[PDB]
Ligand binder design. Sequence first.
Ligand SMILES: O[C@@H]1CCN(Cc2nc(C3(O)CCNCC3)cs2)C1
Length: 340
Amino acid sequence: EQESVKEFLAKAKEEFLKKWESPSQNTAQLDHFDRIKTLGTGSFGRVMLVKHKETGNHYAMKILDKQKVVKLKQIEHTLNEKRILQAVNFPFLVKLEFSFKDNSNLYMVMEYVPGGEMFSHLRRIGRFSEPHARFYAAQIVLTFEYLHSLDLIYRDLKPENLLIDQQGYIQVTDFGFAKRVKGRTWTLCGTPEYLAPEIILSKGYNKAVDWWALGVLIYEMAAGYPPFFADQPIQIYEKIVSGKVRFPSHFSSDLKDLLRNLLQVDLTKRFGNLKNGVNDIKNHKWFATTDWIAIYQRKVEAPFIPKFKGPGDTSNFDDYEEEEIRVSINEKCGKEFTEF
Ligand SMILES: O[C@@H]1CCN(Cc2nc(C3(O)CCNCC3)cs2)C1
């Protein structure tokens, strides 16, 4: 690669390792914030819009229930998420501003991106044109180049995890399955439609699973639906391990060729995992119009800007039952979460 790219990545790794080896802890508390609205909810946590009482700034606060984290075998995953987020720095990653814990919960306080999830915009418009899909895909290619050079795998790429910001660019959120991996890793995790064959088959796997998931994401952005789907997960998995993929006739020949190389069932033949690494993707014909430096510098005009009224507008997120943030009078699971 050009020495300027090599030097960029060498410094990125130096700065990551310094924060990785000495993580920040305990940098706010719950009563520093006013609760506004629930933005999302899952099996062991939720994300709430909050406002800091002294500065007036808005944030997305992820709240994880310690007891549910333990029951669902997510302890190490939640420790990975916070340790990685407090150590990374890249234009297309949502920034962690504070973290802390109390008797009941773990808290990660992230910047609030008001434009909504890419998933909502995709389903409202139907499908993105190839230039629009390519603008987003270029940001993911650069983000994975950064993460993989730090020995990090992301493991949850899908449209719900890509937020659209006030300039129309992507912010990747949700590091719940991200991990530092120097060789292979073995946990079964991720969303069925996006899993690579080697995860489904219980093999030791590597960063090539993120490049498979980028093929699924680019197909879904340009078609409007993912390439492998079915009513039951087991039927999705049969489709994935065949890798049989039919493309819409409106796909360009260059898009089909890129996708056959990202959706390659043999991980040793998959683009992103060959001798030339990410450069097989950056130099592919489907990306011939992409100015990689201009994208990184945020100098390209975006395909659209979300409609919203201000930094606290929630109109691009959906409505959930509003539940208490209860804090037990007694400490739960203190040992398991000592390092958080
Ligand atoms: O029963 C034994 C006593 C403690 N138990 C720890 C566990 N670890 C998992 C992991 O999935 C393994 C891979 N790394 C992510 C977490 C599931 S149970 C195992």
